[PDB]
Symmetry: D2
Subunit: 489 residues, 4 copies
């Protein structure tokens, strides 16, 4: 009811989907129907693919610096529209407006800006072989890539995916999460408004098992970039391979550990833990959900942790004093509660939370209290499985080598962090943790220069950093022979 | 048979597989049984994995310069044993002895030598963020990788895969093709003799559908490197994704084009055409099986090709005077012969060859004469599909933009080549070809410095060159915060 | 004087110089006094050096993306004032308004734009040594750099020198040529309006023997970048080295060769030659002043050269129809005419020009007719020495290996060019030429990505390209030891 | 003397110097004349340069892997003859035999081993411009470069200079120190024996004042690498530049600071201090001659240092237990004795040594006892200036930022080191120290992977690391124009 019927975006104009069916998107703070959104058919994906192939031809035909200037124009618009877009992100995801105004559009435009200035620097190699022959390589675009986004950081994930694709000369077909489609459509307007060729950034909406699947199966799409669940990511990746042998980037979940060593400043460690567990209402791909505290500091540490949680300002995501909103949708809230119920059932001593917040207007919303369990064993479900909700698990260890072994005893490897004041230990311990994103005495910072990605089953490939731009290009090796040819026939 | 029963290689020695199964490997030139080879069981795969996990711990713990010395010592051994192994490769694949003595072991040891000197150079980045924080990356080994090799260049493929894998600090479990398992076991002997830690290169032999599959499903293996056909490569990758989300390198087949431009010296163009079609008896993934001649030179070019083909010395691969051996096996010959029937049947003009050679002692072997088809259209099966046998398809074009457009009208993209004398055309045309390996006035050369891999459905990832060594490491980003930690809680 | 009396630029403002002396800058088109320019004192050098140290500390303190934005605003400002700044560049140099509106500020700002997006890309190395120790490198700013500019491309040289200097986090003290000081002062205004901290770009004006000398001898300045004559550059470098061991970059002169091979299209060969000899009225270091034509084509080539010269529109640099201005000054004119007189004296067959244009209103200016000599020997003065004027020398060669040999036979190595239609010849020939900037079938184009500098006595170090930005930082190696320290004492 | 007349090594042979003069080299341990050494005349430098011109052409004409193998065999020869050369190094330098078998030849072949394996990794860039034009760079040898070595590490310095020089494809003319010429001549044999082309590594011996000067002035030499004192390095750099505008690498002196922070293990801080002052009898450019100890720890630290100094087993370098030899010559000894006598005069509280050892057989040698001064102010001569001897200066500081400010306050900047167990302190402190080699909780280890060189007046350029290999090539930029040429005339 709140917004006009959202249509598909193909070729710089809005288009009509050829399906006749729609789905709704819902405000989690109250339950509003935000908009009826059209779902794409197999015919609409085929249209976006054809629109992207021809649009990419124009984008790639430009100079490195033209694309650089156009993308930089898109940065300028994103900054001028920060407040407008940040509010729209809060309507759809339920994230505090204090967070979306400073983080989502801010750091999403940050990465677009970083690559925008690196486009002219994309280069190939040159190797001499002998007086008569040398090889040189080219870095050409892949062509049409497609990105599938998650719902916790809709606008940023779109930028973190599309920024390097466009910097490298590709067109991207973006499918926003079925939960949060509004914001990605506004980014398509902005890319077109900045001068990006028609077709280079199309947006397809609809159910994940259908339109997302069809994008991954398509014979002309050259790469799939996916953010989401590890379990879903496997089904996605196997499909992208078996269909046409596409290159893939996977940013999946993780049960990331945070080790607090004895010489750590406990006040800093408690600030770290709560930031790593309860920011965005605990709905971050890289949250440090397994906090390893040394037995000797266990009691003092929970004292500091409960003190922070109790002053967490939960409330309406539209209110500026709110730093803790609802969960993304009523279905997801229920599973987070199921895990919370599972932690109680296996006798993991609750400390706070464990309730759905219902008093006053919070019954109209999908509110879950900041929840911390303690005295957890390694075999409990809340220690083994990714909850993707505001649930901190405090584990107790005895030796340094035990905490590193346990941090590693997970099928996940997205993030890890140590907190310590010793030079030797900080570096020695971070080297032993099997994770791609490692923090020392901090948590949650991802600058655009720093490649971020998962070990093991938390991901394949990387995002951000220099390395990521390279993986949106293909190496072509050209050997130039200047001398005579030796045939054995 | 000709050799003792080849056992499994795990932990620095030969071991007995516990499976109870064996298989024969056959010389295609005469039909003699070369050896009985043991097949790995699921327990043996587990044993090799446990050996690699442990052996990799030792290897990564050495200093980069010690590993470099160890790999270089193996190079000296490979040069010491060139003629021995080349002979072994000729019994196992049937390739002429003039080829295996100069190509298979030489260029395999060429690549190992290259990476042997690059180990001390593997480095990570360091990025300043602010006076109070910096990030640095580590290039950690993936751990235990697995390689699955093809049968056309057994020892060469094993070397191109194990060299960067071992140079990066990994342990690799190698599965040679069930067709040609002998040479890879000698490679395990050589690495151990040079000082490689026990377990860093184990070799399991056996079926692709069982032991090869069990490897790609294994949870403790971190990457799969595969060489073979595209239809098989899709299933292999889908298995590695769906199982544990492994990293992959795919070296698949292709129907690579060779465009001969009107200004080409047709004598060089004809030597290039045959070298790209009949070396290794047409069993090279990167063979340029679609030859583009301009109509004005078609007649004279066919003359030049036909004159050269008639000289080809088909005969016993044990004779050093033979330059054209049998195919790898009789089943494969039936398939290559099946395609020839399609070219005769689809009204394509057979120019020479086109039959199986049975004259004299050649009936005991899998011999197909070099076959040239001409007046081929794009709708014919022999133009659209990888034959992997000595079959040349000569296509006629009228202008440049047709020939480049047609060369690209394929789902394959492994190699391509132009033959021309004009500076502007050579560079302009080769830029427009959709292939990862481009040759100008030459063919089939892959220097170790030059990354090689396929576009489109011809591959994922690269081999050789600096970039490949990078893709046997994973990036870990460590952000060190030295200043204060902020918190919204 | 046309303009108000020009002061020094130190600390974000114009200040009064403590010398008591001034000098005039003169319009070469008519003889008009453009401005009185202040001469810098020793106290003024000491004053600007203290300001650059204070400014660099502020500048290095910003985040890389802050520096990137500031520089990008200066790029946008420079695009807005292109025609205005181009007008000022034409009064000061006498170069046509058709050139300065197209080349001078355009390609100077191009380099600033290139480097502006690369600041977040400056990174250091990280090398693990063993589990117990690792090394990382930093790319720290050099500190306070100093630039001494030439007068042929006043505003462009300032940008090409200051763009990498500031992008790397350094402060620069720039001394423009005493002949062309006007534009350097406007750029200091532009950097300040764009947000550059006070002191990061100061401007000192005056004679090289005084102010330029004091800058190269000052102990707190860490690097000197000088563009100018080879004879002068040697004294500058010896002075900067002997004084405090500053690192240096030299862009010096050249007698650059242009080899036309027999199979070249002479129409392009003649178009290249005139552009390489008469652009900017012949006053470019990278001019092709030795043109090698094959004996067979000499007659045809001179004809094509004469035909092109005869349509050169010499005239008032303020006329847009003018594409060939006067020389930069009357003293320099006597020099260019002295060389012409020496070549007439040495029996070179003057083909056209060779005298000063004095007809009508051209008498007020230092106009020299485009001069081409032919039938030249290698020992003549016009062939051996750098003229820096509109004088083309046509030498006749007989085969390829001789022309490469003669072209290399010089103490210079700045630029060289071949013109040919053959793939093999172009690359083989350009590989044997001892010059740092090599063009094939073109001339005089310098993209920002391409490192440009001289071999031999034509220069030290490079400008533009990635490599230059690296050489405006100094490497610091930090080894962190995490284990025990062993001592033999 | 003990050995026959040592001659010049030019063009693969020992040759007769055309000078008629000779000079002697003396064992500092006893005073025996080791050899009569010939001085090169001006005519011999021309012979060695012309030999190097021809020798390099053969060397650069080889493939990267051929050159790599030749250098790699030379490493092997050096490894076998390590203990032989270590014996020769002790006669000439007087350095303990416990040092020369472990450090001098080991770490010299270490760097040669590093670069020998990096030759195929030398690559250039390729940058596209438009469909019709691209730029590529080549990294070509400089040609004939020349090295001047210091006398403290004769074999090590010769290797660290020639290893990257040859790996890049250059020929070197090396002039050993007039003090220590012996080992440099045996290195020339070893290169030739490994297969180095004749002339690629020549050795001229003789006066610091004459032959070294004649090399830096020679017009066909393209680079000078000098290791030695800053006073001479300034004259060296000035002369090589003013003559023919050569590039230089300078490894000059330093008064390197060692900051011991309050939270440090004093025992490790003392092990570092003595090693950083007394290895090689204190004659290393990177010696930590300014030790900064905090006021509170001064007493305990002085004790731990003196406890260690008192057990230094000084003695005859031909002994296996001698770990402290004489100084390199009787002239150098008196200079070191001179600095001590002045430090006594400036009222610095001597702690130990302070005298020349003459008791018993040590009177025949140039033995100087390990000397430590304490309670030092910055005014003193022993604190500002390069002693190059076993003289440790202990400065007392009060708070952290002051010690950083004082340690930085020198015209030198080769090395610096902090000893602390705090993450933030260690890294923040090392970031503000202005030296090219920074050590944390260690000292004096210099791997081949880590570029080493000085800030400020301690050097120009780097040695070791990849970057050093890069700076023995010159970049040539090649722009290929495939489209039309646009001429404005
Ligand atoms: Rb929603
Ligand atoms: Rb993975
Ligand atoms: Rb076989
Ligand atoms: Rb692919
Ligand atoms: Rb002027
Ligand atoms: Rb030079
Ligand atoms: Rb000596
Ligand atoms: Rb310096």
């Amino acid at each position: 009811a709140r917004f006009e019927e959202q249509k598909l975006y193909i070729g710089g104009r809005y288009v009509e989907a050829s399906s006749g069916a729609t789905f709704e998107t819902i405000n989690p703070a109250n339950g509003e129907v935000l908009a009826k959104v059209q779902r794409a058919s197999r015919e609409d994906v085929e249209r976006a693919v054809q629109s992207a192939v021809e649009g990419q031809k124009v984008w790639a035909a430009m100079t490195a610096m033209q694309r650089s200037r156009i993308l930089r124009r898109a940065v300028d618009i994103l900054r001028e529209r920060n407040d407008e877009l940040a509010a729209l992100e809060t309507l759809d995801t339920g994230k505090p407006l204090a967070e979306t105004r400073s983080v989502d559009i801010v750091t999403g435009a940050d990465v677009l800006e970083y690559y925008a200035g690196l486009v002219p620097a994309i280069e190939g190699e040159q190797i001499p072989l002998r007086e008569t022959s040398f090889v040189y390589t080219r870095r050409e675009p892949l062509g049409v890539v497609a990105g599938i986004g998650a719902w916790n950081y809709p606008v940023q994930i779109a930028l973190w995916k599309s920024a390097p694709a466009l910097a490298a000369g590709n067109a991207m077909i973006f499918k926003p999460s079925e939960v949060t489609p509004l914001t990605a459509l506004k980014l398509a307007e902005i890319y077109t408004e900045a001068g990006v060729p028609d077709g280079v950034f199309n947006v397809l909406t609809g159910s994940g098992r259908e339109v997302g699947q069809w994008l991954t199966e398509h014979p002309l799409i050259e790469k799939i970039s996916f953010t989401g669940g590890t379990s879903t990511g496997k089904k996605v990746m196997a499909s992208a391979s078996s269909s046409s042998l596409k290159e893939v980037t996977m940013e999946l979940g993780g049960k990331s550990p945070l080790i607090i060593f004895p010489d750590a400043d406990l006040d800093r460690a408690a600030d770290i833990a709560v930031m790593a567990n309860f920011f965005s209402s605990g709905q971050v791909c890289t949250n440090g959900t397994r906090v390893f505290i040394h037995r000797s500091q266990q009691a003092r540490f929970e004292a500091k942790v409960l003190e922070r949680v109790q002053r967490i300002r939960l409330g309406d995501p539209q209110d500026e004093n709110t730093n803790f909103g609802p969960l993304v949708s009523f279905p997801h809230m229920e599973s987070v509660l199921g895990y919370i119920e599972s932690g109680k059932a296996q006798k993991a001593r609750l400390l706070c939370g464990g309730e759905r917040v219902t008093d006053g207007a919070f019954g109209k919303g999908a509110y879950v209290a900041p929840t911390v369990f303690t005295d957890c064993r390694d075999d409990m479900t809340i220690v083994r499985e990714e909850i993707f909700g505001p649930v901190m698990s405090i584990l107790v260890y005895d030796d340094e080598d035990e905490a590193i072994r346990r941090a590693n005893d997970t099928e996940y490897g997205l993030a890890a962090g140590v907190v310590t004041q010793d030079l030797a230990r900080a570096h020695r311990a971070i080297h032993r943790l099997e994770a791609g994103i490692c923090w020392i005495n901090t948590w949650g910072e991802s600058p655009a220069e720093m490649p971020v990605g998962g070990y093991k089953q938390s991901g394949v490939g990387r995002e951000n950093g220099l390395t990521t731009l390279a993986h949106y290009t293909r190496i072509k090796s050209v050997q130039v022979e200047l001398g005579d040819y030796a045939s054995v026939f």
